[PDB]
Amino acid sequence: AAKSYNIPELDKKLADRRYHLSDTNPEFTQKILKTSRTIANMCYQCGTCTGSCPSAPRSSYRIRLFMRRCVLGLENEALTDPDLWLCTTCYSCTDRCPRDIAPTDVIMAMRNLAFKRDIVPKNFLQTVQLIYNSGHGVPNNDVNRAARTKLGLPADPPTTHSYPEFVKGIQKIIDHYELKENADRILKG
Amino acid sequence: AAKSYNIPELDKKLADRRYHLSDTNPEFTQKILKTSRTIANMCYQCGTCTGSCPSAPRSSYRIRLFMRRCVLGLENEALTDPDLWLCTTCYSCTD
Amino acid sequence: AFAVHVNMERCTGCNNCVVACPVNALELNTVNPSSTDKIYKVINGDAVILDVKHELCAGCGICVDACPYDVIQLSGQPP
Amino acid sequence: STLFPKYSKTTDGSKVIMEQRLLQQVNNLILDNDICTGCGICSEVCPEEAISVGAVGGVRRGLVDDAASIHVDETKC
Amino acid sequence: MHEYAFFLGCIAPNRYPGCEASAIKTSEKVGIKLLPLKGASCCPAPGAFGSIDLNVWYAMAARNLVLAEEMKKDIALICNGCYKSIWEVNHILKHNDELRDNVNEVLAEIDMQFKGTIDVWHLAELYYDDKVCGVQKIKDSVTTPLSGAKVAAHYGCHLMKPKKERHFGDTENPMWFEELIGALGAEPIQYRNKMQCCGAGGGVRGYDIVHALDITNEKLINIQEAGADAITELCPFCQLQFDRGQIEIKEKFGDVYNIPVLHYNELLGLAQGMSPQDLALDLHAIDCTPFLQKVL
Amino acid sequence: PRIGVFVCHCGTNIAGSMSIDDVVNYAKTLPYVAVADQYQYMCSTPGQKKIDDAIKEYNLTGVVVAACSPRLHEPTFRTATKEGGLNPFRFEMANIREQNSWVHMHGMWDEATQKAKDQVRMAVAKAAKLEDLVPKSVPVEKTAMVVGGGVAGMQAALDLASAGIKTYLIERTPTIGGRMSQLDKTFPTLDCSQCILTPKMVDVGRHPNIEMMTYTEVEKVEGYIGNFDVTLRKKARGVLTPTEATAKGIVGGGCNGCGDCSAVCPVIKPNPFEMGMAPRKAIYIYHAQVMPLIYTVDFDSCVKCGLCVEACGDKKAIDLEMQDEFITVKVGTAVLATGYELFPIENKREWGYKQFDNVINALEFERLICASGPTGGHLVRPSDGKTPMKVGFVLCAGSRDNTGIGKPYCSRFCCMYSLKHAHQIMEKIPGAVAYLFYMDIRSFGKMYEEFYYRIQHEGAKFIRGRVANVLEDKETKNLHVFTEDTLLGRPVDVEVDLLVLAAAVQPNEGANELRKKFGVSASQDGWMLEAHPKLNPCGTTTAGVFLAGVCQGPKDIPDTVAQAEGAASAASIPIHMGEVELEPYFAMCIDELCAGCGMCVNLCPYSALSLGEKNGRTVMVVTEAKCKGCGTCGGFCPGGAIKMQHFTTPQIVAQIDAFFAG
Amino acid sequence: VGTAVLATGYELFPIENKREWGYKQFDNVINALEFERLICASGPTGGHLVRPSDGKTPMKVGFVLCAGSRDNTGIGKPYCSRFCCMYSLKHAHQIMEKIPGAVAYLFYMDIRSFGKMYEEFYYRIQHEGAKFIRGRVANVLEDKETKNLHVFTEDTLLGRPVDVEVDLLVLAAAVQPNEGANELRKKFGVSASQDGWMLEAHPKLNPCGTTTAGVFLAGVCQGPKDIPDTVAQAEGAASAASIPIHMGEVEL
Amino acid sequence: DWKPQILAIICNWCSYAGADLAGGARIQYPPTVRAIRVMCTGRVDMLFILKAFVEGADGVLVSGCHFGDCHYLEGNYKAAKRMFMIKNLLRNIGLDDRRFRMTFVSASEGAKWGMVMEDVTNTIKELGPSPIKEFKK
Ligand SMILES: Cc1cc2nc3c(=O)[nH]c(=O)nc-3n(C[C@H](O)[C@H](O)[C@H](O)COP(=O)(O)OP(=O)(O)OC[C@H]3O[C@@H](n4cnc5c(N)ncnc54)[C@H](O)[C@@H]3O)c2cc1C
Numbered sequence A: 001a002a003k004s005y006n007i008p009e010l011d012k013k014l015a016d017r018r019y020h021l022s023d024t025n026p027e028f029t030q031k032i033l034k035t036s037r038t039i040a041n042m043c044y045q046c047g048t049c050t051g052s053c054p055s056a057p058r059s060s061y062r063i064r065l066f067m068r069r070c071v072l073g074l075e076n077e078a079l080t081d082p083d084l085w086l087c088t089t090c091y092s093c094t095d096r097c098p099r100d101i102a103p104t105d106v107i108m109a110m111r112n113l114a115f116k117r118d119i120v121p122k123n124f125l126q127t128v129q130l131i132y133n134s135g136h137g138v139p140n141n142d143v144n145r146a147a148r149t150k151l152g153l154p155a156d157p158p159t160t161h162s163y164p165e166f167v168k169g170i171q172k173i174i175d176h177y178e179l180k181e182n183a184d185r186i187l188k189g
Numbered sequence B: 001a002a003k004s005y006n007i008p009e010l011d012k013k014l015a016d017r018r019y020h021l022s023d024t025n026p027e028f029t030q031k032i033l034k035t036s037r038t039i040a041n042m043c044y045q046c047g048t049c050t051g052s053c054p055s056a057p058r059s060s061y062r063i064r065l066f067m068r069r070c071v072l073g074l075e076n077e078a079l080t081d082p083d084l085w086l087c088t089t090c091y092s093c094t095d
Numbered sequence C: 001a002f003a004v005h006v007n008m009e010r011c012t013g014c015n016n017c018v019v020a021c022p023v024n025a026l027e028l029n030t031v032n033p034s035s036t037d038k039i040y041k042v043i044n045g046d047a048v049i050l051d052v053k054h055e056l057c058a059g060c061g062i063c064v065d066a067c068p069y070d071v072i073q074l075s076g077q078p079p
Numbered sequence D: 001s002t003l004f005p006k007y008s009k010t011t012d013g014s015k016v017i018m019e020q021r022l023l024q025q026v027n028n029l030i031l032d033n034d035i036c037t038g039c040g041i042c043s044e045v046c047p048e049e050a051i052s053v054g055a056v057g058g059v060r061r062g063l064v065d066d067a068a069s070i071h072v073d074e075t076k077c
Numbered sequence E: 001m002h003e004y005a006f007f008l009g010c011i012a013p014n015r016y017p018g019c020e021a022s023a024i025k026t027s028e029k030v031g032i033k034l035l036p037l038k039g040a041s042c043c044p045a046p047g048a049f050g051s052i053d054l055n056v057w058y059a060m061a062a063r064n065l066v067l068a069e070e071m072k073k074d075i076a077l078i079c080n081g082c083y084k085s086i087w088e089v090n091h092i093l094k095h096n097d098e099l100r101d102n103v104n105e106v107l108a109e110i111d112m113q114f115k116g117t118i119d120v121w122h123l124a125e126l127y128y129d130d131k132v133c134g135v136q137k138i139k140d141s142v143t144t145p146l147s148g149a150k151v152a153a154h155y156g157c158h159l160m161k162p163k164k165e166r167h168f169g170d171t172e173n174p175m176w177f178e179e180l181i182g183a184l185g186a187e188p189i190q191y192r193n194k195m196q197c198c199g200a201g202g203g204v205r206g207y208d209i210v211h212a213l214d215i216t217n218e219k220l221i222n223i224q225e226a227g228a229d230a231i232t233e234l235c236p237f238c239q240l241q242f243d244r245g246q247i248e249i250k251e252k253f254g255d256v257y258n259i260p261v262l263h264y265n266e267l268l269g270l271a272q273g274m275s276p277q278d279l280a281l282d283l284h285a286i287d288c289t290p291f292l293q294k295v296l
Numbered sequence F: 001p002r003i004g005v006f007v008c009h010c011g012t013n014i015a016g017s018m019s020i021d022d023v024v025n026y027a028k029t030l031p032y033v034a035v036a037d038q039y040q041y042m043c044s045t046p047g048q049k050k051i052d053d054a055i056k057e058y059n060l061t062g063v064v065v066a067a068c069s070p071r072l073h074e075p076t077f078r079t080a081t082k083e084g085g086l087n088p089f090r091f092e093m094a095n096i097r098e099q100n101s102w103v104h105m106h107g108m109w110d111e112a113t114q115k116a117k118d119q120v121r122m123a124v125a126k127a128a129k130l131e132d133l134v135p136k137s138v139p140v141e142k143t144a145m146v147v148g149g150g151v152a153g154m155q156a157a158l159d160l161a162s163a164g165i166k167t168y169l170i171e172r173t174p175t176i177g178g179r180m181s182q183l184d185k186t187f188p189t190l191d192c193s194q195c196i197l198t199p200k201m202v203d204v205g206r207h208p209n210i211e212m213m214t215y216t217e218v219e220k221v222e223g224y225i226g227n228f229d230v231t232l233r234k235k236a237r238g239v240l241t242p243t244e245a246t247a248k249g250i251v252g253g254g255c256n257g258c259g260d261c262s263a264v265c266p267v268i269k270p271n272p273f274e275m276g277m278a279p280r281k282a283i284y285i286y287h288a289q290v291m292p293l294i295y296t297v298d299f300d301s302c303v304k305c306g307l308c309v310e311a312c313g314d315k316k317a318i319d320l321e322m323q324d325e326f327i328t329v330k331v332g333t334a335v336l337a338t339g340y341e342l343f344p345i346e347n348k349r350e351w352g353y354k355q356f357d358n359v360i361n362a363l364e365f366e367r368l369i370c371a372s373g374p375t376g377g378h379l380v381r382p383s384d385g386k387t388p389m390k391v392g393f394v395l396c397a398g399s400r401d402n403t404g405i406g407k408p409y410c411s412r413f414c415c416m417y418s419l420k421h422a423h424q425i426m427e428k429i430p431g432a433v434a435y436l437f438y439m440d441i442r443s444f445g446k447m448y449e450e451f452y453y454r455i456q457h458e459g460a461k462f463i464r465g466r467v468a469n470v471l472e473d474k475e476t477k478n479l480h481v482f483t484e485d486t487l488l489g490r491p492v493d494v495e496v497d498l499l500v501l502a503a504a505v506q507p508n509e510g511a512n513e514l515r516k517k518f519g520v521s522a523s524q525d526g527w528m529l530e531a532h533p534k535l536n537p538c539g540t541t542t543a544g545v546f547l548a549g550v551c552q553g554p555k556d557i558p559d560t561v562a563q564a565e566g567a568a569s570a571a572s573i574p575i576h577m578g579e580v581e582l583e584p585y586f587a588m589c590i591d592e593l594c595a596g597c598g599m600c601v602n603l604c605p606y607s608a609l610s611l612g613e614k615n616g617r618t619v620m621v622v623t624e625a626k627c628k629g630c631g632t633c634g635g636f637c638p639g640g641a642i643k644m645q646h647f648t649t650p651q652i653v654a655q656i657d658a659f660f661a662g
Numbered sequence G: 001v002g003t004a005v006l007a008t009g010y011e012l013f014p015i016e017n018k019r020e021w022g023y024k025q026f027d028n029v030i031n032a033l034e035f036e037r038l039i040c041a042s043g044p045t046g047g048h049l050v051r052p053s054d055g056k057t058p059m060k061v062g063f064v065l066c067a068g069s070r071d072n073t074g075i076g077k078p079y080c081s082r083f084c085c086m087y088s089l090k091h092a093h094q095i096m097e098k099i100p101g102a103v104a105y106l107f108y109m110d111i112r113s114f115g116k117m118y119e120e121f122y123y124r125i126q127h128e129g130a131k132f133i134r135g136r137v138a139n140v141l142e143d144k145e146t147k148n149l150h151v152f153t154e155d156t157l158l159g160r161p162v163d164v165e166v167d168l169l170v171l172a173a174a175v176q177p178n179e180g181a182n183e184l185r186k187k188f189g190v191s192a193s194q195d196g197w198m199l200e201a202h203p204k205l206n207p208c209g210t211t212t213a214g215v216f217l218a219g220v221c222q223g224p225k226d227i228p229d230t231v232a233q234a235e236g237a238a239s240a241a242s243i244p245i246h247m248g249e250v251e252l
Numbered sequence H: 001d002w003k004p005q006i007l008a009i010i011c012n013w014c015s016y017a018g019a020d021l022a023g024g025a026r027i028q029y030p031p032t033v034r035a036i037r038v039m040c041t042g043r044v045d046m047l048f049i050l051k052a053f054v055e056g057a058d059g060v061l062v063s064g065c066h067f068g069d070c071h072y073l074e075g076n077y078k079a080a081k082r083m084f085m086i087k088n089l090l091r092n093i094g095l096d097d098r099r100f101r102m103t104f105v106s107a108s109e110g111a112k113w114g115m116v117m118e119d120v121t122n123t124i125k126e127l128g129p130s131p132i133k134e135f136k137k
């Protein structure tokens, strides 16, 4: 932690673990507050959220730690953490927080910022592709069409699987935010 | 963390991270107190020791965490930690 | 002053809950009828209980014992 | 609040058991619904006006299940 | 006969069509009329799509809402995740003006406006309400007792939580869904940590399948210990997790449970006399045949 | 009239926002103004000397001071005006600091100067029309009332009585003592609570200057600082004290506390003193150390079987037909000491308080651990009666909580009493371990930190994490406590045999009704409000009423007793003098303008107005003692027949006219 | 005189003995009464908080809570001074409202806001944006040129060491009995507590009177307290001292 | 050439305390309102308001305690009824009734007092000079 040596393994081993005031990103905090629509700066680290999380007992995921990073503005610590995608959004933390914070909403805002900086698992991008193509995250297939027919339902549900003219409107909605143009670019690699 | 699966990589990945009262070794704590000749059970986790350590800013070594493990009796957590040998015994924490 | 509930889904309009109720039978079958109000009347094929505010029933069970395909549940506990 | 005056009213088979828990002292007013006859000589007599009378005919004929001949407010008893 | 637009998201029509078929039939048997939604799509699934972009989540949920707005009807749902998306975006855009404005100028590119005129209901919520079909009406409609079956309920998380954002009451130990299973004649049993997440929410099902399956396996262990013969659920996500994930648990771990997973609408159909073939119970990974032997 | 205008600088607090020279020159050119002048600190002795010299030299009729707020410095400048040969009430202030300077500091100077000139003009216009008032002095009845028989009420009553004032001690329950009588031991010294309090209970019971009225409530209060006509409801106790028995004619006596009545009573009900854990008959005492040992009858649960009277025999202490008697008592001052109750923690469903057997709260734990409680002092599990070996303490249970269910404040003593209970279990059950799930240990008082050190030394485990939820094991009835060890950085699952919730405290039941009877307001927190939060924590805004104890906010027994003696001193101040001066803001009816319509009579909350006969004409009559100076009647009366003494219509209208003068 | 009331108050514990916080040796390290005089509008400055080293306005201010308190090493005091968490919150609010854009860092170890409206005050300070770092300060280093102060501790909740560089460091020092208080209480015959404050007759039920009759305690001289508690204690002592004077007799 | 003339009549026990608290907390607001300070708002007669408006108040503000928080148990209910009736009279004599309002400011709401000051100033500035001053002639 003396300085930068430019030997990557030694830089990884002797990374400065010490928090400085140069590490705080108030812009990151303000973006999180705006997007999450929650009073996240009011956490006093009681640990109820982590005590209620179902992901915590089997991983290194700590929602209280993510709340602390949000409060201190530790962008590039929160966003690059691979345990940002282990939240099931079960809302137990939000159900129990004594300060009326929505830590899962803070997690959602963090995930949006991570996507905007191009950190995102591939299942999310594949779901974007599927919804762009057919409007359905879990689309129909031939075997289910046969099963529906044997039941007595129409071979396709009344959705955009049977009314393909609304797919164009869905595609314009997605294209307005450029979600497809980012998902395909990130997938290409 | 549901139970033991006997697939070593999955056991490593889903190790139970949750402290139970079965994890405490009071015999370990008493041996530590006897050998160290110090009142270690009286720590209230102020963080001054870690704030003064010269090994902490460049590693995962946390003397306060080791004190907490001693208090809670977490034998096999304290002893097997490879950051048990990064203390230079500079005595700043004790100071 | 109890509460009776009629399962409209399996009521056939048999009218044996109307004929057998001893509060319905007060008007035409009593000397100097006292009260002429009626718990049930079969409107549109199912038994309707006019006794909305649960003032006239007496938990007799003549109507529960009468319906051929059990469809009248009698509640003996305060509504 | 406070919990230990635990007032319970359980229908154990054919006996309606009305209870008041403490740590070690209980109180069990037990009504045997096979012997009750639907008279009110238990409601007229109640000094504390808790016992009320229910669907006597239905219960005594077997056509009522969710009630006994009499209801006792075990919080007032 | 109350009439509702039937949203019908992705998993029920495309993986478990018996769920939607029984939904329509049983809802019609009780006093409810479920009308098809014209060109509805994926409710932008709250985890896998809300994690990516909240603004497009809002826009797609609002489009789904304005379809039924033009229909002039109240949405009825059968999925907790779809409930989250549809109901919560409806609630947020009924009160937040700048978000209304943003969504409206996004939707104006497809000649379509959100005004906030309808309400969103879960089908089990309707079955429980007293104005609409109540528990007593469900008991009346039941024609096959389904007696002598131990059935474990999974509430899910997105229907009831957070309780500061919903209106279903206590989240620590609700019993309302246990009353609907008791109406059918099956005895609902209680298991340890019954309010635990199934593990499939938030996209974890896709991102880390082993993590999600461990969360599911904790539940399956508790349910087997209680002694359940089936798991009722009110969510096609949770049904997919409890159904596929039993197979993936059998292969990735060495755990065998063979516990059938059924939607409450499928159990209601079984109670009201629908056939297993008409419910398409052959489309589940886990065979329902032991449960059918018990309740038939 | 001749008015002097004195403009304070407040040491640049005002001169740094306006032009004091310009304000002074404008005051000089104003009409009626004899002298206008300025000084750096008009509230200081040279400032009062300046006022007095100006009065003497210029023969001033009235004084206007352009300075800070009247609510801060009316008494100072009224006394300065008196010393100088004027009436105190020929004085008027112009608030040009807290309403001109501090709010128009930045970038706007001539605007603040114009505002100051306007305020000075309005003040001069009012003061040119003020005239002489003399404050009303009213006699003070030499008795006092203390509502509440807890430690704070008993201390206040003993203090007043030993100062010599006759005192009434009203307690709703059949015994004095309060919560401290329920406590088993006390932090931070570990003394037995009853042992330390019984001496003081005996003093209260024996004091000749204390009229101890237990099992009695306050129906209604009317009056003021002078005489409070307090009506008391003497609830039907059902049993006669020896004095009352002799008065009624029974020579053999009344109740001697033998216990035969409760030995034969067949009714069995929960004991509220033991928080419901223990049985008590229909005729009962809370505990064996109650101060009036007189054996109340619980008429809501008595069946009038008459066995108790046969057991009592010739003592004839039991009167089963007794009814609520009403008494009216005149008192000079009143002290409110209503205490507190535990917040209903069953609303927090994640901690299964009512739904799991082995989850209790801290007063039930204190009764279970006391040697006089339902158990023989042995802590046992409610579920099966077995001795616990692991006990958890959930601190902050319902406190510092902004979700709308719990309380947003700290209850002050719950960290300390949880430490006491951990010590008690670790010393009474050998090998038992105490786990405290805490979030800011708050040991702030004298010897509290040392107590905390000693508890940690004896070996309580301190886990810094607020409990998330509690699950009950289906078979052993053990409780699985789930939280995170925030310092360790891992989730935890501690399985305990007994869980104790350190619940928040809230104002007692009926306390809001009583404080509305007495005219006291409430705080943001919901506790009774004090006159000034810093420098007057005992008195209230309504004169003659004082606060003592937890009723004003949670506190330990030391702080409660200090507050109680402070309140007793404040209540003794006017009784010892015997006079008290009221503020001469009363309504005065001008009879040869009153038309006798009687419509104003119903506009007085204090019933100070009535219709009476004067010179044949029916006119309105003001009870000047009962009037409080609000002005509702005088703002109503269409004919202008009601005059408000320092805020008369001509004065207020002169202020309006001066504002619009240009 | 008939009775006597002792109200000697308190002084700040000498915090220059704790050498790791360079109180006397670094210019820009002050204590809480010096900060209160610097922030008052009637003080040496025009109410403008400026750095002692160069007279420039600070933009980052650190508050070292527990400075010399809850300390069993023999240098500091083993007790809590009661009001230092509250006054540090007040000072953080004052700097954040008086200097636009200034940030307050509180290095704390158990925030103790126990009194009436204290928790709400704590909530409001956090809302206005004071940073609360749960870690007792380990040591303080002074930058040789800018005279800025490098505060070293661990963020115990975050789990990492920290190095916060502030322009001004304020020590919330412990309080101790005033100078000469022991001499005066020996003149009057009053004993001392374990803590060193004057002792009361009964710690629970008589916090004003002493064992020597006719002498009563009031204020911080009996133990640290806020102005509300001090005034309640003072009026209690006045009442106790009036009890024998009003009677005029007293029995020995 | 024109500056609004707004007159406030604030009770002593909550609105004067709130204004004082705003001043103490250093909450800035424009210097357009001048206050009178009566004991309760029950003291405020209708003729005070009408006299202000006929002398030429571009606006009038009456500030008092919240309902249930009057120092004198119920003196602001009387004021509220009186001001409702005053709103009706000004509307029917054809003067703009939004020149008058009654706000309930507690003793601790210095921020709300500042916001009330700002909003009253803004509303009167939008409304413009009162018509009485030219209708008199
Ligand atoms: C579990 C627990 C443990 C505690 N342990 C300690 C400890 O170890 N040490 C310590 O110092 N403090 C302790 N405390 C705090 C202590 O109990 C209080 O400081 C103290 O009891 C305050 O007494 P009080 O007289 O103000 O109120 P209370 O003791 O509640 O007395 C109020 C009295 O007024 C009566 N009353 C109420 N309303 C009316 C009415 N309308 N009319 C007439 N009478 C009325 C009540 O019946 C009661 O008798 C503990 C508190 C709890 C909850």
Ligand code: SF4
Residues within 6 Å of the ligand: A042, A043, A044, A045, A046, A047, A048, A049, A050, A064, A067, A093, A096, A097, A098, A099, A101, A103
């Ligand atoms: S529960 Fe709320 S207050 Fe507690 S650590 Fe989590 S976010 Fe912070």
Ligand code: SF4
Residues within 6 Å of the ligand: A049, A052, A053, A054, A055, A056, A063, A086, A087, A088, A089, A090, A091, A092, A093, A094, A103, A104
């Ligand atoms: S919402 Fe996410 S962080 Fe909160 S408890 Fe559920 S999994 Fe944990």
Ligand code: SF4
Residues within 6 Å of the ligand: B042, B043, B044, B045, B046, B047, B048, B049, B050, B064, B067, B093
């Ligand atoms: S051991 Fe470390 S954390 Fe514990 S009290 Fe000492 S300095 Fe603080």
Ligand code: SF4
Residues within 6 Å of the ligand: B049, B052, B053, B054, B055, B056, B063, B086, B087, B088, B089, B090, B091, B092, B093, B094
């Ligand atoms: S002795 Fe030195 S290196 Fe070892 S823990 Fe203490 S400060 Fe760190």
Ligand code: SF4
Residues within 6 Å of the ligand: C004, C020, C021, C022, C023, C024, C039, C056, C057, C058, C059, C060, C061, C062, C063, C064, C074
């Ligand atoms: S129970 Fe008897 S009285 Fe009541 S409705 Fe039936 S038949 Fe009529």
Ligand code: SF4
Residues within 6 Å of the ligand: C006, C010, C011, C012, C013, C014, C015, C016, C017, C018, C042, C046, C047, C066, C067, C068, C069, C071, C072
């Ligand atoms: S007897 Fe039964 S089936 Fe016939 S009308 Fe009555 S309820 Fe219906």
Ligand code: SF4
Residues within 6 Å of the ligand: D035, D036, D037, D038, D039, D040, D041, D042, D043, D069, D070
């Ligand atoms: S009704 Fe009452 S009195 Fe009659 S038999 Fe039953 S219990 Fe006895």
Ligand code: SF4
Residues within 6 Å of the ligand: F008, F009, F010, F011, F040, F041, F042, F043, F044, F067, F068, F069, F073, F097
């Ligand atoms: S009278 Fe008021 S304005 Fe003048 S110096 Fe004193 S406090 Fe300041």
Ligand code: SF4
Residues within 6 Å of the ligand: F239, F254, F255, F256, F257, F258, F259, F260, F261, F262, F294, F295, F311, F312, F315, F316, F317, F318
């Ligand atoms: S028997 Fe009579 S004297 Fe004895 S305790 Fe009972 S009431 Fe009192």
Ligand code: SF4
Residues within 6 Å of the ligand: F264, F265, F266, F267, F281, F282, F283, F297, F301, F302, F303, F304, F305, F306, F307, F308, F309, F320
């Ligand atoms: S009359 Fe009977 S019930 Fe009442 S107290 Fe006496 S013995 Fe008990």
Ligand code: SF4
Residues within 6 Å of the ligand: F395, F396, F397, F399, F400, F409, F410, F411, F412, F413, F414, F415, F416, F439, F440, F441, F442, F502
């Ligand atoms: S005193 Fe302690 S336990 Fe009680 S509310 Fe305050 S911090 Fe929590």
Ligand code: SF4
Residues within 6 Å of the ligand: F589, F593, F594, F595, F596, F597, F598, F599, F600, F601, F619, F620, F636, F637, F638, F639, F640, F641, F642
């Ligand atoms: S004072 Fe006025 S209101 Fe009162 S009676 Fe006389 S005329 Fe009527």
Ligand code: SF4
Residues within 6 Å of the ligand: F586, F587, F603, F604, F605, F606, F607, F608, F609, F622, F626, F627, F628, F629, F630, F631, F632, F633, F634, H072
């Ligand atoms: S001013 Fe009038 S209404 Fe108010 S208290 Fe006095 S007499 Fe009553």
Ligand code: SF4
Residues within 6 Å of the ligand: G065, G066, G067, G069, G070, G079, G080, G081, G082, G083, G084, G085, G086, G109, G110, G111, G112, G172
């Ligand atoms: S009051 Fe706060 S800062 Fe002062 S010694 Fe106690 S805990 Fe430390």
Ligand code: FES
Residues within 6 Å of the ligand: H011, H012, H013, H014, H015, H039, H040, H041, H042, H063, H064, H065, H070, H071, H072, H075, H076
């Ligand atoms: S005291 Fe302010 S409105 Fe009455």
